[PDB]
Design an enzyme around this catalytic site. Structure first.
Site, short mmCIF file in Angstrom:
data_model
loop_
_atom_site.label_atom_id
_atom_site.label_comp_id
_atom_site.label_asym_id
_atom_site.label_seq_id
_atom_site.Cartn_x
_atom_site.Cartn_y
_atom_site.Cartn_z
N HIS C 55 39.00 -24.99 -2.14
CA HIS C 55 38.82 -25.31 -0.72
C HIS C 55 37.62 -24.67 -0.08
CE1 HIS C 55 40.93 -21.40 0.22
NE2 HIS C 55 40.07 -21.43 1.23
N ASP C 85 44.08 -24.31 -6.84
CA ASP C 85 43.05 -24.08 -5.81
C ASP C 85 41.98 -23.08 -6.33
OD1 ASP C 85 41.52 -24.00 -3.50
OD2 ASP C 85 42.98 -22.89 -2.30
N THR C 143 55.78 -27.62 -3.37
CA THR C 143 55.34 -28.38 -4.53
C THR C 143 54.31 -27.58 -5.33
OG1 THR C 143 54.52 -30.53 -5.29
CG2 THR C 143 53.40 -29.55 -3.37
N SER C 160 38.82 -15.82 1.23
CA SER C 160 39.20 -16.73 0.14
C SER C 160 38.22 -16.68 -1.01
CB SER C 160 39.28 -18.18 0.62
OG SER C 160 40.47 -18.41 1.32
N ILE C 218 68.54 -29.68 -18.69
CA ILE C 218 67.84 -30.09 -17.47
C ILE C 218 68.16 -31.55 -17.13
CG2 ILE C 218 65.62 -30.27 -16.29
CD1 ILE C 218 64.50 -28.21 -18.24
N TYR C 271 47.54 -36.03 -17.79
CA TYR C 271 47.87 -36.31 -16.41
C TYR C 271 46.65 -36.85 -15.67
CZ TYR C 271 49.16 -35.63 -11.55
OH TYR C 271 49.41 -35.82 -10.21
#
Lengths: 4, 274, 272, 271
Positions: C55, C85, C143, C160, C218, C271
């Site tokens: 970010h 991040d 999440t 940051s 699970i 993914y």
């Protein structure tokens, strides 16, 4: 840089 | 084992930190803050903005004594002020070690009277040194600290774990134009600067600075009257290597004093900074 | 007697923490480079690899890195990772670089003293002190389920991407976010998060190598699972928490076939 | 060299700090119980007693306690005290409980390092570090004839009722509240308050014993309706209950209702  | 504690610094330094009340006719407390007793004579440092436009200034000691204080003088540029009270009895005075060099990451303790709750100690470290502070325009030197500072702490002490004075708490970073809230950003005047300013104020009732209205030169000033683009190689028989060191030298020189300004020899008469 | 001090940790670590500036070309009308946002970074090794937050450097037209010793570089964006991040920059340095002290064997503990090193509000390099408040925190968002150190060392905007270190100057984490999460407008105090250095290192190496973090994809509540054919008791011969498992899945290479006992033969896919 | 750390205090004390949940019933149509508010508490001993703040369990229909080892428990409200904002709870199904280190001989000093242990914003158990900023404070409230520890250990919503311990893990206090508001729109930073552990231990025992804090009242040293004293205004009390006359109003509180003491006054319980 200054003023005096 | 014993509990990790900085109560030693507290015992040593806290008695010397006082509550300062700025009273104005309406009398009523118009504002308040803190102060540090510097020596046995009864001289006390504080912030100018704390004692500005006061009709009466009150000092209170942690031992219970209260005093009407006299305003010896003040300085806008450093936002420092000196007060005076007369005590037959002994006074508590702040431990000072003029040889101590403050380091980034030194543990410190802020001593003051936040919101008039009574004396408060808070703990942080020295976050940084040599900071212009909140104002880029302002050309000053500040210690930065994450010791929690609040309204009421101004003029009070910042001390290391030995109880030695490291600075005078001046202000917290409370604002952004955005309105975002800063956390752990607080400033103090370095003790060595605070001592130099106190002595000046005690002697002259104000800080008398040298002005020369001006190394490469980029109205009615001392320079203008002595006689742009000129190169100053020597000021008062001192080699002009850095512009920062010279402007500090000028400040020091007393008004009315005549010095040789060599440029590639003019006689300039120093005047007070307006 | 000498003053209590964490200056030793400051001397060891602070030189390897840099100021990071995100500058844009379409930020003013004259298309001159201007800061859009700023933060901090940590020089990780002598090649010039620097960790920061994603970010901080998102959508930058130029990334600038400024060292405490005065040097200024334009940095290359090697890769970044939304999930954690984290971002990795590279500067081309000559004459050597300061690198952050790392102790790969050090286990961070709750209550360990830590120092946050960064550039709050662009005031210049700032050190703040607190402790490790917690470990294994999901952070601000439920999440992702990513590990965070929590700390009460004061973090502000500009911190940051910067370093959180212990009293020996050892890298504990990468400061990411201060908890400004109040929909009450009540102000949280001393709640800040950092990416544990072990994770940050692992992400860096993945980004350095692949230009991006390649993750495998699970009671079960056009996917590899759909195509394979419920209670999963074992995945790839490993007993199935859901958090430890999904971290297992991420590690396994695309194209690898594994046994999912619930025995189905699933083919892992990258993914997107 | 080893990293400087207060983990020893964490290991010793943290397990005995619990998450407390106040659950009321929604008459307005959700039907079921919901969290009204939440906080922290301190397991004081092996019988399962737990200190916390009254404002944290006020008006609860159910009180849940969670331990850091995983276990959960329905909790019984043993008693509470508005005046100190303290509340005692109890948890059964004891198979062994983590307890908070206490040192009744430890005198807290200003400048002592302290750790606040709590559940800020229900993030999970959180340790923050500060020092004892002050002692004998009224806090952010009208005087209650009681005193507070001040600390700069960062406290937030969810810390209330949790422990304030020193570097050895010894209970110094029960964190009650942060400083709330500003005269000029500044944000108070590092001003928090906790109930001294000694006072907390006294109130706990009183609550366990009587279900409430029974206090002596005398309806009143210079004196400035239908009260025990009703003694005249402007009267000078030099002695109360054969003891030379803050210390007195604490002595009254201690005396039992129905007890006659030297005028012959009859103490009555405070309402």
């Amino acid at each position: 840089v200054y003023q005096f | 084992m014993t509990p990790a504690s900085y109560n030693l610094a507290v015992r040593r330094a806290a008695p010397a930190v006082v509550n300062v009340y700025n009273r104005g006719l309406n009398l009523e407390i118009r504002t308040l803050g803190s102060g540090v007793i510097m020596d046995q004579r009864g001289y006390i440092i504080t912030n100018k903005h704390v004692i500005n436009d006061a009709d009466q200034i009150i000092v209170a000691l942690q031992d219970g004594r209260v005093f009407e204080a006299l305003l010896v003088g003040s300085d806008s540029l450093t936002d420092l002020a000196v007060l005076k009270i007369n005590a037959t009895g002994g006074l508590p005075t702040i431990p000072i070690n003029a040889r101590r060099v403050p380091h980034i990451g030194d543990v410190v303790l802020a001593i003051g009277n936040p919101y008039n709750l009574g004396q408060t100690i808070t703990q942080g470290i020295i976050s940084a040194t040599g900071r212009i502070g909140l104002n880029p325009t302002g050309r000053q030197n500040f210690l930065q600290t994450d010791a929690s500072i609040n309204h009421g702490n101004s003029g009070g002490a910042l001390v290391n774990s030995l109880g030695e004075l490291m600075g005078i708490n001046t202000l917290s970073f409370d604002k952004s134009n955005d309105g975002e809230t800063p956390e752990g950003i607080g400033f103090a005047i370095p003790f060595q600067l605070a001592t130099k300013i106190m002595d000046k104020l005690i002697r002259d009732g104000r800080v008398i600075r040298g002005y020369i209205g001006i190394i490469v030169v980029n109205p009615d000033g001392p320079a203008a009257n002595a006689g742009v683009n000129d190169l100053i190689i020597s000021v008062d028989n001192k080699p002009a290597i850095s512009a920062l060191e010279t402007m500090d030298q000028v400040a020091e020189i007393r008004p009315g004093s005549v010095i040789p300004v060599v440029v590639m020899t003019l006689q300039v008469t120093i005047q007070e900074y307006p």
